[PDB]
Amino acid sequence: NALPTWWKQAVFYQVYPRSFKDTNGDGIGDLNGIIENLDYLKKLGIDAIWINPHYDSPNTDNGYDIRDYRKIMKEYGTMEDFDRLISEMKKRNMRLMIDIVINHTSDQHAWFVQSKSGKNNPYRDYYFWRDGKDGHAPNNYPSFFGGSAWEKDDKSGQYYLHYFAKQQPDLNWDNPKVRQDLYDMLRFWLDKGVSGLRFATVATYSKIPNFPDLSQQQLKNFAEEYTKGPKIHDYVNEMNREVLSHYDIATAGEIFGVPLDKSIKFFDRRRNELNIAFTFDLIRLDRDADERWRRKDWTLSQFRKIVDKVDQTAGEYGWNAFFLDNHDNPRAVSHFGDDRPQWREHAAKALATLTLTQRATPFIYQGSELGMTNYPFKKIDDFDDVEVKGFWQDYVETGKVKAEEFLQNVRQTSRDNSRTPFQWDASKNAGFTSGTPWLKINPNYKEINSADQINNPNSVFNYYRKLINIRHDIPALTYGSYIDLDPDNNSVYAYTRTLGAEKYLVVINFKEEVMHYTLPGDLSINKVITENNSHTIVNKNDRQLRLEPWQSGIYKLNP
Ligand SMILES: OC[C@H]1O[C@H](O)[C@H](O)[C@@H](O)[C@@H]1O
Ligand SMILES: [Ca+2]
C-alpha cells in the first residue's frame, strides 16, 4: 500500500494558548493572541494547529479541568473569538485540532455538582462513588497528581475517583448515558468545522471491574494498570462508529500509560479507532517509572532503538505522531540537545532535522522553532504546575527525598519548562504581554526571540522553514521506510528514508567534536539536500562525511 492523507503529510504546530500571546495585558495568552499571529505560523510553513484546552475551567490543571465543555475559557476570550480563529485559519488554509478531555471533568462541572448532591441524584453514576474500606479509601489507588486517587465526600460518606487532581473527578464511561452526552458534546465542536481532535489520556476511560487493590509491584508502575480497562477498545470504537467516522477529521490518541506492544490497537486503521499515535516511549526514555519526576542518564543508542521500535510498531496499518517536547515535557534543545550558547542553535537545527524526517506526522511545539530552552527554576515556589506540587507533597514533605535533590531533578523534568511565555521579541517581557506574565519569562529572551530570527536566513526559525519546505517536496521524507544504519552507535545518528528507488540519508553528529563517518555497503551521495554546520564540501559519489560537532544534514543517495 502507502495510503496518503492530509494528516499524514501535515506539519502540525502546537499552541499552548496560556503562554502564546497576551493581547489584553492580564499576563495570560488568549485567542486573539493566536489570531494575531497566524501569519507568523503561515510564514513558518505550518499546515495545522493543535490548541491545548480552550474551555471554561477553574484552571487547577490549566484547562484540563473543564467546568463547561460548551463555553470558552474566560481568560482566552469569547465564543466569537473562537469562531473567528476557525475562520481566519480557514482563510489561510490551516486546519484546527482541539483537545478533547473526557476522562474527567472539573469538580465544578454541573454534572459533578449534581452527582455529589446525593446518592439518589440522576447524575450520581456519571462518576465513580465507592464506600471506604476499614475507615480508609476504597483501595490503595494513587493519584498522578499527589496522594490517593480517592477523595472522601462528607455529605454522602462515599469516596469519588480521581486519577488526576482532586478537582478532576473521573467520568463513568461504563454508563451509556455519559458516553452519549460526551458524543453530543463532540458534535457541537465538530459542527463548527474543527478538523482534528486530540484525545487526552485516551487510554484510561475504562475502569477496572470491582476496583481491586494494586500489588506492591503495581504501585510503582500504576499508570499501566489504569490502561488495562477491559472495555477501552469497545468505547473508543463505539465513539468512532457513532461520532468520529461521521466527520472528516484527524484524531490523535494520547496513550499515556500504554506499553508500546499495546498501542497498535488504538491506531490500526482496520480497527476504526483513532488515526495518530502520541506515545511516551521516546520523550520520557530517561524518566523513572516509579518516581516519575526523576530523570536518569540516557545514550544515543538507547534513543535510536526507541525511534526504531516506535516506527516498527506503527508498521503498515498504524501511524505515529513524532515530537521531542510539548507542554508536558522539558524543551527539546535542553533535554535532547545541548543548550549552551556555543551549541544551542546547531543542536536545535539538528533536532529539527531529525523531527522533520520521520515516518510520522511531526508536531512542532511553540517556541521550539526558535530554539527556546528550559527555564532556570530555583526554588519550589518558582513552579506553578499542580503536578510538581503533588510530587513535592508525596516525596519531599514526607521526608522521602531531600528538597534539593528533588529540585535538581524537577528543574530538568518539570512541565513548566515548556510553559514559560513564547519569546516574540527583545522588548520588555519578550513582547508577550503589556502587563505581568502569569509565569516568568526566560531572561534568555534577549538572545532567543522570533524578531531576531524571522528575517535572518541563518536562524533556527528559517532552518525549520527550509526543512518543512523540503519535507513537502520529497515524498520519501514522509512515507518512505526507515532503516537505522547502526542502532548501537552512540555518536553519529544515521538513517535512511526510502520509497522505491528514491533513497535519502539523514546524518546527525551528537558529539561536540569532529566525527568522521564512512557510509556502509555501497551507499554514496548523489546530492546534498541541506546541512547545518558543515565545513567540508560534499561531492558526487562521496562515501564519507567529516561531521563538524552538532552537524546535521539530509542527502540523496545514488540508486
Ligand atoms: O488532565 C490530565 C493531563 O492530561 C492531558 O492529556 C495533558 O496533556 C496534561 O497536560 C494534563 O495534565
Ligand atoms: Ca490575555
Author numbering: 42 to 600
Please share text taken word for word from the publication where this structure appeared.
NX-5 (named NX-5 in this work) that predominantly produces isomaltulose (~87%). Similar to other GH13 family enzymes, the NX-5 molecule is composed of three domains: the N-domain (residues 42-145 and 216-520), the sub-domain (residues 146-215), and the C-domain (residues 521-600). Among them, residues Asp102, His145, Arg239, His368, Asp369, Glu428, and Arg456 are responsible for sucrose binding and residues Asp241 (the nucleophile) and Glu295 (the acid catalyst) are crucial for sucrose hydrolysis for PalI, MutB, and SmuA.
Inspired by the work from Ravaud et al., we obtained the crystals of the D241A/glucose complex by co-crystallizing the D241A mutant with sucrose. This demonstrated that replacement of Asp241 with an alanine residue did not totally disrupt the hydrolytic activity of NX-5, as observed in the complex structure of MutB D200A-glucose. Moreover, the D241A/glucose complex structure may represent NX-5 in an intermediate state of the sucrose isomerization process and could be used for molecular dynamics (MD) calculations. After sucrose hydrolysis and the exiting of fructose, their side chains bounced back to the original position in the active site pocket. To elucidate the mechanism of the product specificity of NX-5, we used the GOLD program (version 5.1, released by the Cambridge Crystallographic Data Centre) to dock fructofuranose or fructopyranose, a transition state analogue of isomaltulose or trehalulose into the active site of the D241A/glucose complex structure.
